[PDB]
Ligand binder design. Structure first.
Ligand SMILES: C[C@@H](C1CCCCC1)n1c(-c2cc3c(cc2Br)OCO3)nc2cc(C(=O)Nc3ccc(C#N)cc3)ccc21
Ligand code: NA
Length: 556
């Protein structure tokens, strides 16, 4: 009588009509007094006996089996199921009626094909699971395992490797310390950066706009850290509600992916202004705003399967309510794996490829412009110290080509200036005057007039400081900031993005493959070190924003 004993645990035993109107052991009356009097045979007046419950429950089971064999969609599955799983099917028919269970056409076909795991997942996403989760879990487990374990042992604790981490000092001492540091450092730093970009930056370039959302993504996550620190200090125990847990989870992964996308935009935008600069600083800004809105809305849509799933679970053995750290429904690991594998490819690797190659083109272009300005001054310094006509004509020729290449290059100042603008035409014209004078010294150098061409070098010095040096004065300083910028971003990927996304796939891959993951400790440290991006983000603003440097230095 295992089926009879199983149902008693699910339906309970009550001798009075109660709201789930039912009575006895899961005997449905109506959707109640009149339906009970003719079912028993007498006027029970709402209260039945302990003996009449058993007699009516034993008849409900015999009828639940007859309907199964009567049904053309329930009989073949029932004939394929082992006696343990047969009770689970009868448990559903006992609860949802013959017709209700017959609606699960796809899962019943899976159960017939002995695919217990696939059938379990299908049953986990239904109104049945939504209305009675604890009830459905026990029945679903009976299908998946084929044992009575779901009714013998109630949930008590997680795996040993997780239970030690959730009670160890790594989570209860190390994490809140690191999180506290980030809060003190990242909140006012990004707080001031957002202030500078909005109320102190009067350029409003596409770079400022991307950095403003970067600081905003930082702020919208760091503000919740006081609740995050308290969570860990008290032994990974959440007492603030399920909705507020899913908020922190949402804003955590949001800043995680906004940072990557806004890093790719900034890096590409700043690289694009050097290779092929344009001249619509007002339109390119509006575009950059729209791109930010598109990114902001795209992440709001992609973090939906994080807002809406149960992310809290009470662990009896630990007496704590964990947020995020433990997955309440171990049947969704298949969905979780694909989800974080999609993001790791399309929102991690793909933006990393565009981010890395952007600095490849950016640094090289800034390195070439540096070499031109250096070849110019060096060859101009040789002429004043060369005696033979060979070194004079040779230095003039190398200086000529150096100025012809710098003419095609974008000056550090005219970044948002289009190549057809007057500013660019005056820049190039400054070289046309210089190049012409080099030909006037080459005219003498090629006509054998050695010393007369050396005197022209002093004339070339005047043209350098007047028309050229003004634009290329601090081009080597701009290259150094770009290199440091490439280093800052590379470090942010090496510490905050790559360990998280890599382990996120590995973590859910092992729970899907073995039911436990030994990288659980690394998974937690990865997620912890991922929050450092908002502490490294101020270094990005320092190397990109010029107005932010002023407010950074003046403050300290
Ligand atoms: C557009 C922004 C705002 C920018 C203005 C300050 C409020 C945030 N935003 C972000 C966000 C926050 C971020 C971020 C990226 C995003 Br897309 O980076 C770090 O912080 N998450 C957001 C979430 C919501 C909502 O009601 N959801 C929601 C509610 C119920 C259910 C169910 N069932 C599912 C989802 C609304 C705006 C959100
Ligand atoms: Na960030």
């Amino acid at each position: 009588s295992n089926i009879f004993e199983m149902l008693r645990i699910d339906e309970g035993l009550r001798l009075k009509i109660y709201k789930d109107y039912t009575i006895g052991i899961g005997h449905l009356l109506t959707k109640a007094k009149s339906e009970l009097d003719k079912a028993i045979g007498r006027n029970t007046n709402g209260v039945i006996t302990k003996d009449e419950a058993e007699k009516l429950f034993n008849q409900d089971v015999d009828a639940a089996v007859r309907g199964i064999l009567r049904n053309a969609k329930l009989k073949p599955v029932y004939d394929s199921l082992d006696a343990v799983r047969r009770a689970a099917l009868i448990n559903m028919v006992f609860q949802m009626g013959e017709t209700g269970v017959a609606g699960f056409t796809n899962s019943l076909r899976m159960l017939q094909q002995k695919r217990w795991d696939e059938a379990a997942v299908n049953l986990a996403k239904s109104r049945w699971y939504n209305q009675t989760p604890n009830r459905a879990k026990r029945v679903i487990t009976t299908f998946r395992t084929g044992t009575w374990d779901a009714y013998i042992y109630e949930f008590f604790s997680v795996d040993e490797f997780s239970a030690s981490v959730l009670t160890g000092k790594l989570t209860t001492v190390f994490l809140p310390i690191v999180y506290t540091i980030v809060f003190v450092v990242a909140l006012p730093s990004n707080g001031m950066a957002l202030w500078v970009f909005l109320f102190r930056t009067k350029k409003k370039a596409p770079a400022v706009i991307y950095m403003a959302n970067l600081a905003l993504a930082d702020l919208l996550s760091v503000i919740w850290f006081p609740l995050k620190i308290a969570y860990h200090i008290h032994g990974n125990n959440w007492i603030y509600g399920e909705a507020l847990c899913n908020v922190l989870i949402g804003f955590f992964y949001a800043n995680m992916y906004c940072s990557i996308l806004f890093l790719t935009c900034l890096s590409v935008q700043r690289a694009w202004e050097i290779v092929n600069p344009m001249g619509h600083s007002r339109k390119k800004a509006n575009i950059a705003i729209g791109i930010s809105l598109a990114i902001w809305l795209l992440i709001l849509l992609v973090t939906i399967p994080l807002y809406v799933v149960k992310q809290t679970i009470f662990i009896p053995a630990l007496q704590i309510t964990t947020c995020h750290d433990v997955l309440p429904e171990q049947l969704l690991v298949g969905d979780m794996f694909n989800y974080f594998l999609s993001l790791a490819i399309g929102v991690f690797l793909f933006p990393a490829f565009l981010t890395a190659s952007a600095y490849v083109l950016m640094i090289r272009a800034l390195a070439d412009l540096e070499d031109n300005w250096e070849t110019l001054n060096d060859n101009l310094k040789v002429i004043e110290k060369a005696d033979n006509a060979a070194q004079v004509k040779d230095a003039l020729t190398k200086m000529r080509a150096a100025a012809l290449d710098a003419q095609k290059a974008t000056p550090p100042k005219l970044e948002d200036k289009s190549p057809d603008s007057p500013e660019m035409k005056d820049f190039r014209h400054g070289f046309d005057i210089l190049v012409g004078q080099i030909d006037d010294a080459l005219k003498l150098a090629n006509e054998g007039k050695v010393k007369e061409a050396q005197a022209a070098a002093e004339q070339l010095k005047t043209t350098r400081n007047a028309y050229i040096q003004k634009y290329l004065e601090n081009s080597e300083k701009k290259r150094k900031r770009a290199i440091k910028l490439a280093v800052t971003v590379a470090a942010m990927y090496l510490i905050c993005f790559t360990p998280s996304n890599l382990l996120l796939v590995v973590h859910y891959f092992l729970i899907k493959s073995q039911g436990q993951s030994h990288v659980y400790a690394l998974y937690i440290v990865a997620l912890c070190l991922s929050t450092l991006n908002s502490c490294i983000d101020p270094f990005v603003y320092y190397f990109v924003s010029h107005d932010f440097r002023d407010h950074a230095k003046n403050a300290l």
